[PDB]
Every structure is written in C-alpha cells, then in structure tokens.
Amino acid sequence: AYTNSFTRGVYYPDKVFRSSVLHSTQDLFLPFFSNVTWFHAIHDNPVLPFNDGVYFASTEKSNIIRGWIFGTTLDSKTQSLLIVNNATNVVIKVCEFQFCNDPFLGVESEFRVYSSANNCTFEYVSQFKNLREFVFKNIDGYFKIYSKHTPINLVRDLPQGFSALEPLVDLPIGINITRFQTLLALHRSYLTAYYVGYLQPRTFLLKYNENGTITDAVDCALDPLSETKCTLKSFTV
C-alpha cells in the first residue's frame, strides 16, 4: 500500500529565532508528494531499512504504538538501540541485546523483546485526533529526534496543511544503524496505522512569519515553477 505526503517532515533546522524573512537550507528532508508506505491492522512488522534517516508517523486512539529498535544485525554480535514507553515514562538503552525473532510487548504484561541484555554503554529515562510525527537522523555519533503532535481531521488520509516539527532529544550513542523495526502492544502474547518515509538531501526555502513560525516551504527540486521560485527567492512570480 501507498499514500501521498503532500507536505510532511519539515523541521526547524537550527535553534535561532527568525521573524518575517525567507531562508534557504540544505538538509535531509522528506521530498514533497512522495509515496509513504502504509501499515494497518484490519482484523505486521518487518525489518525496514534506515538508509539516511526516516520519517515516521502513526495514528491510533488508545496507545498501541510504543517504540522502536535500531541496529545492524539484531543478533547480539554488535550493539543496538531500544526505546519503549510505559504510558508513564520512556526507557532508552544501548545494550548488546539478543533480540527475539518477533519482538512485541504483551498487554500490564511482560517483555518479549530481548532474551539477553549484556554489555551496556548508555542508559536514559524521561517522561483519530492524534497524529504523531517523527524524524530520526544518525549523524556524527549522535541520534537526533524531532516531533510534533496534531489532531487529524480525517479518516485515513494525511492532512493537507503545513506544520513544522520542533527538536526533542539528541543522544550520544556512537553506533552504526542500517535497519529498524517498530514495537507494538499485543493483547494475546504470542512469542512466535503507521507510515514510513525516507529522507533525501534536498534544498528547501523556508518562510518565517511575524511570530517566528515556519508557515510555508518550497521544495526546489519538485517542478520547474518551484525551481524558478528558489532562484528568485520569493513565493510569487
């Protein structure tokens, strides 16, 4: 399955306040009107690649989506990463896990994700009208995360307007990531709705308003009209 992004995964690229200007930025972004893969539970979690960074969105009503694992082999030969919510706090952990071949969390119920957890270098702890959007990047021994939540007005399709993602957390983990897998909350514990887009090296043209808010953008490689607007540094031609 596939859907259409239209405007998804624009984040604040730095930490400086800017009001009522235009600004041109090279980063890793999600290109406009690209195909995002669809996963639903009409009544499945494979090992998706990472490759340069990931857009992640998810929507349910009552707390099914909870966390991810990131790594290379997932076979306790190399280090790996883990993020889980408790519906109270969040647990982040960089041990040398031997992962199960089908990780999930039983409904309070126990953990069926890792058997062995040795050799830990990092640990951390923290705290349809819900669309939760995420961007993950892995640059220079850091793991950056951007996020924003909005009430979806719709049934199945992604909304049409514009909203920018604020930065959340930056983690010094020092590992090599090539694959990842999301973690669900399964009722019947069988030891055997969310969107994924990929980030590309682009150039964007960001508009800041009177109040400092990013309200519009232009993907300079979308079409010839936007390639014109990026050369003229304005939004009307």
Partner 1 sequence: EKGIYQTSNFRVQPTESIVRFPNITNLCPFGEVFNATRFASVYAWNRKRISNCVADYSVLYNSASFSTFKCYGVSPTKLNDLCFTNVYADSFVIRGDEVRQIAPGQTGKIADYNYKLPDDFTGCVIAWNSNNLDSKGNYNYLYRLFRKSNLKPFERDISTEIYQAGSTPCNGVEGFNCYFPLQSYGFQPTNGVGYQPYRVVVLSFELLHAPATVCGPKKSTNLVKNKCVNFNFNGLTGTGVLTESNKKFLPFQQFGRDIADTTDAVRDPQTLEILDITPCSFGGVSVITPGTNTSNQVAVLYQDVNCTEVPVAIHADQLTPTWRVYSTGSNVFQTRAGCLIGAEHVNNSYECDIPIGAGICASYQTSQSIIAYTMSLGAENSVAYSNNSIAIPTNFTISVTTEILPVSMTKTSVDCTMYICGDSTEC
Ligand X SMILES: *[C@@H]1O[C@H](CO)[C@@H](O)[C@H](O)[C@H]1NC(C)=O
Ligand Y SMILES: *[C@@H]1O[C@H](CO)[C@@H](O[C@@H]2O[C@H](CO)[C@@H](O)[C@H](O)[C@H]2NC(C)=O)[C@H](O)[C@H]1NC(C)=O
Task: Tell me which residues touch ligand X (CB under 6 A).
Answer: 2, 35, 76, 86, 88-89, 91, 96, 118-119, 125, 209-211
Helix (H) or strand (E) holding 213: none
Binding of residue 49 to partner 1 (CB under 8 A) = no
Binding of residue 72 to ligand Y (CB under 6 A) = yes
Burial state string for 161-195 with b = 16 or more CB within 10 A and e = fewer than 16: eebbbeeeeebebebebebbbbbbbbeeeeeeebb
Residues 107-136 that bind ligand Y (CB under 6 A): none
Binding of residue 118 to partner 1 (CB under 8 A) = no
Position 181: which residue type? Answer: Q
Handedness of CA 30, 31, 32, 38 (dihedral sign): negative
Name, in order, each residue with C-beta under 8 angstroms of 236's C-beta and a sequence gap of 6 or more: none
Binding of residue 52 to ligand Y (CB under 6 A) = no
Q: Which tokens sit at 106?
A: 């039983």
Residue in the structure block whose two tokens are 């959007």: 133
Write the binding mask 152 to 171 for partner 1: x where contact by CB under 8 A, - elsewhere. --------------xx--x-
- Position among 35, 89, 115, 178 found at the interface with ligand Y (CB under 6 A): 178
Binding of residue 213 to ligand Y (CB under 6 A) = no
Q: Which tokens sit at 37?
A: 């893969």
Tell the smallest beta-carbon distance from residue 80 to ligand Y (Å).
12
Q: Which tokens sit at 166?
A: 């604020």
- Position among 41, 201, 212, 225 found at the interface with partner 1 (CB under 8 A): 212
Binding of residue 14 to partner 1 (CB under 8 A) = yes
Pick 123 or 231: Cβ nearer ligand X: 123
Pick from ligand Y, partner 1, ligand X, none: which does 110 bind, CB < 5 to 8 A by kind? none
Order of strands across the sheet that contains 96-106: 111-118, 96-106, 185-186
Applying CB under 8 A, the residues found at the interface with partner 1 are: 14-19, 21, 77-79, 96, 119, 121, 140-142, 166-167, 170, 172, 174-176, 211-212
